[PDB]
Amino acid sequence: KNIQVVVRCRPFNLAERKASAHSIVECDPVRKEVSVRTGGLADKSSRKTYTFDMVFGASTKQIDVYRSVVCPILDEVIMGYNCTIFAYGQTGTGKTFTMEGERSPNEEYTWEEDPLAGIIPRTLHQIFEKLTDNGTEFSVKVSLLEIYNEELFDLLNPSSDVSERLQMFDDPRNKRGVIIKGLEEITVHNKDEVYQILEKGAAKRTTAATLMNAYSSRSHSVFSVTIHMKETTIDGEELVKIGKLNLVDLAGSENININQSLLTLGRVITALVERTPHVPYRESKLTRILQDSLGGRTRTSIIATISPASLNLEETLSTLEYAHRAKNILNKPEVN
Ligand SMILES: Cc1cccc(C(CC[C@H](N)C(=O)O)(c2ccccc2)c2ccccc2)c1
Ligand SMILES: Nc1ncnc2c1ncn2[C@@H]1O[C@H](COP(=O)(O)OP(=O)(O)O)[C@@H](O)[C@H]1O
Numbered sequence: 001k002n003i004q005v006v007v008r009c010r011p012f013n014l015a016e017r018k019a020s021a022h023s024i025v026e027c028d029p030v031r032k033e034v035s036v037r038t039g040g041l042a043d044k045s046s047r048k049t050y051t052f053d054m055v056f057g058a059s060t061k062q063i064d065v066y067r068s069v070v071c072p073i074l075d076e077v078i079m080g081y082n083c084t085i086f087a088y089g090q091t092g093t094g095k096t097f098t099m100e101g102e103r104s105p106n107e108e109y110t111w112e113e114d115p116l117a118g119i120i121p122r123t124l125h126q127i128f129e130k131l132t133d134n135g136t137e138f139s140v141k142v143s144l145l146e147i148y149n150e151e152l153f154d155l156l157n158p159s160s161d162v163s164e165r166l167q168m169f170d171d172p173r174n175k176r177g178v179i180i181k182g183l184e185e186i187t188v189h190n191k192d193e194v195y196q197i198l199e200k201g202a203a204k205r206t207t208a209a210t211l212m213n214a215y216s217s218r219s220h221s222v223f224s225v226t227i228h229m230k231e232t233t234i235d236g237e238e239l240v241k242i243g244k245l246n247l248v249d250l251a252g253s254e255n256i257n258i259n260q261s262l263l264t265l266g267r268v269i270t271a272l273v274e275r276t277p278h279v280p281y282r283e284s285k286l287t288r289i290l291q292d293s294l295g296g297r298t299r300t301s302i303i304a305t306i307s308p309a310s311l312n313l314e315e316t317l318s319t320l321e322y323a324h325r326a327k328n329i330l331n332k333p334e335v336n
């Protein structure tokens with residue numbers, strides 16, 4: 001039942017080293033604990049310690065995250081589940097790095113072989129391996145929207161202006177899901193179509209950041225992957241199983257209509273752990289989209305990102321307290 005929650009702590013950055021930052025985070029992958037040093041100069045012994053499903057310290061690499069977190073989820077997508085992974089944390093702590101990753105400088109690497117590639121690129125590659133050897137005819141379609149100030153933007157649309165808005169409506173073929181009217185879904189025929197599609201999306205995203213104040217930290221980003229697989233049974237009946245993967249990069253947790261989605265996510269989580277009736281899904285775009293992933297038939301994970309520095313203490317505790325709280329959400333996962 002319960003949603004899986006894991007924590008990643010990023011290494012120091014150069015500004016932090018320049019400022020003589022001290023660490024206040026200790027990860028123990030084996031005991032699965034994060035432990036925060038909380039007493040500054042006054043109490044050297046003080047700590048807060050939390051247990052998670054998995055933990056990744058400052059030295060963890062993108063391959064590691066992928067191997068430990070995603071391969072398991074990928075398999076269940078391939079058996080025809082819906083899964084969602086998403087990233088939660090204060091701006092600057094590695095949500096985008098974790099979910100998308102970055103390109104290594106000077107085209108030193110092919111995109112499939114980049115050690116900085118995040119979950120999204122690695123996953124699309126992986127989907128073509130696991131599935132070609134297998135034969136089993138399959139199609140893959142991707143989508144990429146952003147929520148900003150409760151407006152919806154389509155990063156993969158042929159339309160040349162990012163500012164053109166999507167709309168959502170209740171799926172009548174699913175009591176817990178939404179249809180995004182206007183959303184471009186692109187068929188991806190081989191692993192060699194991938195980079196160009198991404199690159200398009202990245203450029204459309206660069207423009208948007210210049211149109212909208214604080215775009216990169218105030219927006220939520222929803223990448224989806226849909227898979228259709230043909231299976232003939234032992235009888236010879238030809239049945240098609242469908243699996244979906246949503247990859248969410250949330251707005252910075254530090255914020256808190258500009259904030260409606262982050263707020264309502266908070267409340268939705270609360271109403272679930274405190275077994276309240278009438279969870280407020282309807283009250284935001286994000287939560288209408290994520291509704292099946294919090295409480296519903298989708299299998300969900302959450303990556304809490306944090307910074308190791310003494311300066312970010314209050315936000316770091318904040319992220320851990322909120323993440324740990326979410327371990328108490330139980331979904332009823334089910335195939336399609
Ligand atoms: C839309 C997207 C999803 C996942 C990764 C990427 C990256 C990084 C996107 C960057 N994080 C951003 O937010 O703009 C990219 C694609 C194409 C050209 C350059 C970079 C990418 C793809 C594969 C390997 C590394 C980075 C872009
Ligand atoms: N796990 C990590 N390992 C190495 N560098 C990281 C890691 N996470 C983040 N960084 C660096 O810190 C910066 C902020 O990461 P980013 O993904 O933009 O965080 P967010 O999207 O949460 O604001 C980037 O320069 C990124 O390269």
Ligand SMILES: [Mg+2]
Binds near residue numbers: 095217
């Ligand atoms: Mg970001």
